[PDB]
Amino acid sequence: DDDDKMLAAEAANRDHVTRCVAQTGGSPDLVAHTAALRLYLRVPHFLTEWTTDPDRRAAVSRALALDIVSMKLLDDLMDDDTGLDRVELACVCLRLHLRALHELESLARDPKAVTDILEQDAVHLCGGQIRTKRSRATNLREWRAHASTYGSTFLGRYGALAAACGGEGQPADSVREFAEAFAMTITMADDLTDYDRNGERDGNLAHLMRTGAVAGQDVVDLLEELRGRALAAVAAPPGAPGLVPVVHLYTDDVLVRLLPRHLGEAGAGAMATVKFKYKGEEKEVDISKIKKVWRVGKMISFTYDEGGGKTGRGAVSEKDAPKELLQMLEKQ
Amino acid sequence: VDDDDKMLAAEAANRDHVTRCVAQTGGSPDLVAHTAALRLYLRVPHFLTEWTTDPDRRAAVSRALALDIVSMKLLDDLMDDDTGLDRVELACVCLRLHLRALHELESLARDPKAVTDILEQDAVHLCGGQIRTKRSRATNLREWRAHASTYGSTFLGRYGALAAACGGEGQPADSVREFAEAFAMTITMADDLTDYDRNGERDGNLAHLMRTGAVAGQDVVDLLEELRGRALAAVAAPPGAPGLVPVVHLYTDDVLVRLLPRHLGE
Ligand SMILES: CCCCCCCCO[C@@H]1O[C@H](CO)[C@@H](O)[C@H](O)[C@H]1O
Ligand SMILES: CCCCCCCCO[C@@H]1O[C@H](CO)[C@@H](O)[C@H](O)[C@H]1O
Ligand SMILES: CCCCCCCCO[C@@H]1O[C@H](CO)[C@@H](O)[C@H](O)[C@H]1O
Fold this sequence. Notes:
- The structure is a homodimer.
- Chain A has helices spanning about 1-25, 30-35, 40-45, 55-80, 85-105, 115-120, 120-135, 140-165, 170-195, 205-210, 215-235, 245-260, 260-265, 325-330; strands at about 275, 285, 290-295, 300-305, 310-315.
- By secondary structure, chain A is mostly helical.
- The first copy, chain A, folds into 2 domains: about 1-270, Farnesyl Diphosphate Synthase (Orthogonal Bundle), CATH 1.10.600.10; about 270-330, CATH 2.40.50.40.
- The first copy, chain A, has a 3-stranded antiparallel β-sheet with strand order 3-4-5, with helices on one face.
- The two termini of chain A are about 40 Å apart.
- The interface of A and B includes residues 115 and 131 of A.
- The complex binds octyl beta-D-glucopyranoside (3 copies).
- One octyl beta-D-glucopyranoside binds near residues 38 and 39 of chain B.
- One octyl beta-D-glucopyranoside binds near residues 38, 41 and 188 of chain B.
- Chain B: InterPro entries: Isoprenoid_synthase_dom_sf (IPR008949).
- Chain B: This is MoeN5.
């Protein structure tokens, strides 16, 4: 049912946005383009998760949807590659944005709160976007510094806005920290998806990965860092435990579905190995060399490839058996 | 000492506030010079704040208005994509200026909410209006003035309403707006009749219609006189802004004396 709320909020946000876009005169095209922004349309649901009143929640949620979409249209306008009419984009972008300011301001805890948040880091956001397209990233550090502006800062502002407009019990800093961490996970997913869906290369993370400039394991660590930051934010009282599955879902999808498309054969960080003594020795073998493996009580017995058609042998306690070895077990 | 010295200083102050903001947010020299070349856009806020007595408040409202008007102008350059400027810079500087203006205007308004109320009020009329203008070009004075009332009149009308909401006591709000709406149409015509040669502009362009006979000189003269009268009236309502009277005459007469002759029928 939390999943049913999510869907219904996304649908309500989609509705609010498309009606507003058609009434301003945008084509059925642009209308389809915006209704297609499913995550952008659902994110407002996550940002408003700390809002106790449901009537305020739905109102804040769609107001955020209006502005997030408007900013996405602005981005479409700067790249001019959607096929969409430049004029309807411009005009629809502005219109949604003014509607959003009106709605958010009508729900804010203070009359200056909305414009303070939008102004506070406008230079960081705007100059940051310019710099992102002016100097393509060539390593993880650069890719990350750029993504913290058009991804993190970008969504963080909406996080601050959700807290500013969501009545009582909103832990301002936490909603915003959730937003900035979640935005980066989402931005990464996007780069690794759009490498192909879109044909993107310069400054793109999937390209940097396929190119060697950034290593799989460092991407896993950043994803893990972002997961932890988001979980902590979501844990600060009064808590938004409903966001826990959400954070896992997105992080895990990047790890399980998207990374492999750019890392290949076991793109972790190191070929797993098994250590053991055999005939007074000290041996270590790559799970890749391992042929057969079976269990005798709590011991794990196996055979492997030494060099040529030279069959090696070994047995270890399961406690010293790397997960990878234990898997060939159940897989044998 | 005179009003001309006040106008010139305001324009300069507006230009500098604008260029400093464009440069700090990453705008390049071509984009910075481009915003400094929008002369009338930087000057018009001086006219709209003419009812504001306190000179500090006036200078502050005037430059905040200049930020947003420049912003909308960059967004327009962005949709037409014909200036040869970087679309990312235009877009980003556009947003930055607009957000700074919201912030400066809300800090000056009696009631902050009034700033978003005014901008929402006729957002559809202005944005849907700008789409149709570009969709289907004007073919006669009727159609031309209907379109200009959106991207010209409503467009400046809003800033007129903002100048009143942010300019303290006095301000006869409906009149400031009426002045802005009529004056905006006069300069939009002016611009259209300069833009002919300076843009390779034909469809829906008033000068094109004039030269091809679709529009009659006397009707244009009439429209200009109607606009002058409406503007003179707006500035004579109380409290009154006498300083705008010669301004209304200067721009109207310039269109009648210098621009129209450039466009006889055939
Ligand atoms: C109503 C607020 C301003 C709208 C009318 C301004 C149109 C005339 O403004 C003119 O625009 C030209 C083209 O960009 C510039 O080259 C000129 O310097 C400027 O004076
Ligand atoms: C100056 C304008 C800044 C706003 C542009 C970025 C805001 C939305 O832009 C979007 O950002 C996403 C990350 O959230 C990217 O993954 C998408 O490719 C991009 O469309
Ligand atoms: C969607 C609304 C954004 C654009 C609104 C109009 C912004 C100003 O647009 C300007 O207005 C002038 C007024 O005469 C015209 O002459 C100029 O050619 C035009 O660029």
